[PDB]
């Protein structure tokens, strides 16, 4: 009684699931070959990023012992990146399998204390990257909930966009890096909130008369603005 | 030719992906949904109404708010059944044995 | 009125809405004041379908 007879058609018919498998098992069914994802991009640890940090490009320090070899983003990518899907793009900035900095706690109270002091969340440390399908499902559910909350709201799509950008930037595992990307949409939502309040509650101001040199040149057109 | 997509352009990449030999329905990508809160919400609502766990599990039903079905499955029914018959008989359409049915389906769906 | 002017007094599509700098306008709104509020001195309007 052999185990898994009908379960490896990839082996029976020489079908590679990916170019790495193709290169390994020598099926040679990928015309363009394979450029291997190096190990520093396949795995690694969280690092500091800003140039205004003294420990820049250095691994993040945790209460637990952790390998200090860092994930290196793709800074000099090749011109032709044949797969421009999210699957192949995400590997340039995060490792798909997550970082290698996760703990195995010898006790429950260590876990408790780390969480209590803000140095551990399983959401963050025992997790992979999210797939495009997962991101889209989350975004669409959130959009449905927001539309149900209020259709006649102008900041709707802005809230949806900040959610979308956080999900795409993988804020579960890199929240500070993602907030750095999404605070612009938060700021735009903050503006839209006041613009809506001032339209609902009629707020206006006495505008001054027109300036003597509103036009720089007499032959120039003074395009009227609301 | 296929240049790198920076991280700032990924939100547009998710809903307007590049062209492939196997593309999705970009017009329907905002309609793909799968609720992880369906059964928890159902249980919470029923237990708040006052039912027991057994009654809730008997009354539970799976979510209808999922990704919509392909209309080709209802419009191209006979063509698809014939193609699957051809494939089952001819070993998956090796050396172009189901090209007849596949081309008929492609023409019907595309129209130049 | 703007939507009708664009679509030539003919049947427009469903759930069509106007936006300026990401901010959706109500249909019973004055375009001038809505632009003054949402997009001051950037009157670029966009017409989109709001299904959601």
């Amino acid at each position: 009684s052999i185990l898994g007879a009908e379960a490896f058609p990839e082996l029976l018919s020489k079908v590679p699931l990916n170019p790495q498998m193709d290169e390994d098992k020598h099926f040679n069914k990928y015309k363009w070959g394979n450029e291997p994802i190096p190990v520093n991009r396949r795995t690694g640890s969280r690092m500091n990023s800003s140039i205004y940090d003294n420990r820049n490009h250095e691994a993040v320090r945790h209460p637990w012992s952790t390998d200090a070899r860092t994930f290196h983003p793709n800074d000099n990518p090749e011109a032709d990146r044949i797969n421009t899907q999210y699957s192949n793009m995400v590997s340039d900035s995060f490792p798909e399998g997550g970082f290698s900095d996760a703990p195995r706690f010898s006790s429950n109270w260590e876990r408790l204390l780390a969480y209590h002091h803000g140095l551990y969340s399983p959401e963050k440390f025992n997790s992979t990257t999210k797939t495009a399908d997962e991101i889209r499902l989350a975004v669409n559910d959130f959009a449905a909930k927001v539309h149900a909350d209020d259709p006649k709201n102008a900041c709707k799509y802005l809230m949806i966009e900040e959610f979308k950008c956080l999900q795409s930037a993988q804020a579960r595992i890199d929240p500070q890096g993602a907030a750095t990307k999404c605070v612009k949409w938060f700021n735009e939502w903050r503006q839209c909130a006041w613009d809506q309040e001032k339209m609902v509650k009629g707020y206006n101001y006495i505008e001054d008369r027109r300036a003597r040199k509103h036009k720089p040149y007499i032959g120039a057109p003074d395009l009227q603005y609301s | 030719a296929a240049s790198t997509i920076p991280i700032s352009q990924w939100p547009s990449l998710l809903y307007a992906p590049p062209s492939s030999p196997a593309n999705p329905a970009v017009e329907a990508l905002p309609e793909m949904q799968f609720d992880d809160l369906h059964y928890p919400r159902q249980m919470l609502l029923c237990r708040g109404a006052g039912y027991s766990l057994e009654q809730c599990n008997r009354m539970a039903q799976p979510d209808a708010r999922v990704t919509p079905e392909n209309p080709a499955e209802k419009l191209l029914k006979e063509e698809a059944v014939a193609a699957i018959a051809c494939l089952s008989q001819r070993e998956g359409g090796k050396d172009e044995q189901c090209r007849y049915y596949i081309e008929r389906m492609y023409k019907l769906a595309n129209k130049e | 009125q703007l939507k009708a002017q664009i679509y030539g007094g003919k049947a427009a599509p469903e759930n069509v809405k106007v936006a300026c700098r990401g901010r959706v306008f109500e249909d019973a709104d004055n375009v001038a004041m809505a632009v003054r509020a949402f997009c001051k001195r950037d009157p670029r309007l966009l017409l989109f379908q709001d299904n959601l």
Binding site: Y157, I160, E161 | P11, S12, Y15, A16, P30 | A19, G22, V24, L46, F48, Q49
Partner: peptide
């Protein structure tokens, strides 16, 4: 579609 997918 959403208004932010527009760029041009």
């Amino acid at each position: 579609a959403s208004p932010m997918l527009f760029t041009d």
